[PDB]
Design a protein around this ligand. Structure first.
Ligand code: ADP
Ligand code: 7WF
Length: 239
């Protein structure tokens, strides 16, 4: 579930280009539920109406998937070969990369035991949010108390893996907030805990994919200068 801060992003009529799926590099782990929903949707209508958003990888004949992991992964699993895509000026100042702030209403202790059991630490720390925003720890866990979860990407992934299982189990009301202050505004209405990491930079996203590595789901949150207008492409054109 997603809460976004009413971003008036303009639709623009930008033409698409067909790009081969094997030229596209993911930056996030897939979510099988989203992959599955896309497969049902595209095979149902037979129309692919929403182009990929790509960025050229410097120094490679490859493209970063900015938006479209489950379209990409879904087309591949169907045996398709290309997707209509819009190529972004990614390093333009007009493109911004934020993160998501996974927040939860629910009980802290079940989450701690599940986090601790995967090898993560949860040390109580009133500078945890400050450390996390500087990128010094993996996550700050902020509710009634503040806790630091140390480490880097490996630890962040473990945290995401645990949260998604407990969202699957129904032990928390997992909402990914676009902005953490909206998680704190809703927190004051009386959310329980909010996870905060430093946002990825564009440069880090590109580095990670050149390494053949990926983030957890809901790590990047791109704010773009436009949404492409809808397109008229038949599924059969993609094979
Ligand atoms: N028939 C379709 N053609 C093209 N896109 C579709 C179709 N049905 C659903 N979608 C889109 O596929 C997307 C699935 O998520 P996607 O953007 O690929 O992953 P992520 O945003 O995590 O990179 C959704 O935006 C959804 O609206
Ligand atoms: O360049 S491609 O052949 O991959 C796709 C075209 O850009 C499709 N355009 C052609 C011009 N009109 C709108 C669709």
């Amino acid at each position: 579930v997603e809460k976004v801060p009413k971003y008036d992003i303009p639709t623009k009529k930008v033409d698409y280009v067909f790009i081969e799926l094997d030229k596209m590099k993911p930056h996030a782990q897939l979510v099988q539920k989203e992959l599955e929903a896309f497969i049902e949707s595209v095979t149902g209508s037979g129309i692919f109406w929403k182009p990929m958003l790509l960025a050229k990888v410097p120094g490679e004949d490859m493209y970063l998937i900015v938006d479209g992991h489950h379209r990409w992964a879904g087309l591949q699993k169907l045996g398709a070969k290309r997707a209509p895509s819009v190529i972004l000026d990614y390093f333009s100042d007009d493109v911004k990369v934020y993160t998501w702030y996974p927040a939860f209403k629910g009980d802290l202790n079940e989450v701690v035991e599940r986090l601790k059991k995967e090898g993560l630490e949860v040390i109580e720390d009133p500078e945890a949010e400050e450390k996390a925003e500087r990128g010094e720890i993996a996550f700050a866990l902020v509710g009634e108390k503040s806790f630091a979860i140390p480490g880097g990407l490996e630890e962040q992934k473990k945290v995401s893996k645990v949260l998604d299982e407990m969202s699957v189990e129904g032990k928390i009301e997992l909402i990914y907030y676009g902005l953490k202050e909206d998680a704190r505004e809703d927190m004051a209405k009386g959310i329980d805990y909010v996870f905060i990491r430093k946002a990825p930079t564009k440069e880090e996203v590109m580095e990670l994919v050149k390494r053949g590595e990926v983030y957890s789901p809901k790590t990047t949150r791109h704010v773009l200068p436009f949404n492409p207008d809808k397109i008229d492409v038949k599924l059969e054109e993609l094979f």
